[PDB]
């Protein structure tokens, strides 16, 4: 298998808003769960051993034995039979305290047609203004249907200088972050989607370009969602992977 190439082609959707995904069309989507079985965040499988997520998802415990990753799932609760459920062995937080972290699985994930890593961007690459991307997760829906199933939403990327204007996020967004969403509102990632992916199609595969982090509410007008810019941490991520 090749990274970022799903074995089920995802539906262009005509998480708040968006739609329920085709089962297993996003094979790198991870459900990060407490030791005692509660979904609380998302993550992205970037190789058989490594899960990329948000640092703040881990604040309630520094012990790896407190977390387990769920791979290949479509439902939040009553998981399918062939879902993979691997304990986390190590936790690595980015060393300048940005909102991204790495989990190391205790046994590598079996790569099947339902569990496939996503590709990493070239380091320090800037996703251009108005690039169409996708967000996925099991997060809050605010009555836009799809509760309890893996949802997706198609979002345009909004460049930082525009996103940082007073009428939008008014300076809050750092250069190691990116914004995405519809300025009209109605579509966003929401609570329960943190750590999950923002991927953008390039040539023939999806490239993980952001990690779901924060926002001023969800799906509000003039308030797009903010994501950690994954290309700014690629050299770090690779250094951790190659030494652990």
């Amino acid at each position: 298998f090749d990274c970022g190439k799903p074995q089920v082609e995802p539906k262009k959707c005509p998480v708040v808003g968006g739609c329920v995904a085709h089962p297993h069309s996003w094979p790198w989507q991870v459900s990060l769960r407490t030791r005692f079985g509660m979904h609380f965040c998302g993550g992205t499988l970037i190789s058989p051993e490594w899960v990329l997520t948000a640092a703040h998802c881990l604040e309630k415990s520094p012990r790896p034995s407190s977390y387990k990753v769920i791979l290949g799932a479509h439902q939040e609760v009553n998981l399918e039979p062939h879902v993979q459920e691997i304990e986390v062995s190590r936790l690595f937080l980015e060393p300048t305290r940005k909102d991204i972290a790495l989990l190391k699985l205790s046994s590598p994930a079996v790569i099947t047609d339902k569990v496939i890593p996503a590709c990493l961007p070239s380091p320090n690459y800037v996703v251009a203004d108005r690039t169409e991307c996708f967000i996925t997760g099991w997060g809050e829906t605010q009555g836009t249907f799809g509760a309890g199933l893996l949802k997706e939403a198609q979002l345009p990327v909004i460049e930082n200088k525009v996103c940082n204007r007073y009428e939008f996020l008014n300076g809050r967004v750092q250069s190691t972050e990116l914004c995405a969403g519809h300025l009209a509102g109605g579509t966003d990632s929401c609570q329960g989607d943190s750590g999950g992916p923002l991927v953008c199609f390039e040539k023939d595969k999806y490239i993980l370009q952001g990690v779901t982090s924060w926002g001023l509410g969800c799906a509000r007008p003039n308030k797009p969602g903010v994501y950690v810019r994954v290309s700014r941490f690629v050299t770090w991520i690779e250094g951790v992977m190659r030494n652990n």
């Binding site: 948000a54 703040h56 329960g192």
Partner: peptide, 14 residues
């Protein structure tokens, strides 16, 4: 106003 999108979320006065 900044709210991190975990469950449960973490919100700040900005």
């Amino acid at each position: 106003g900044r709210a991190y999108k975990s469950k449960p979320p973490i919100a700040f006065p900005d």
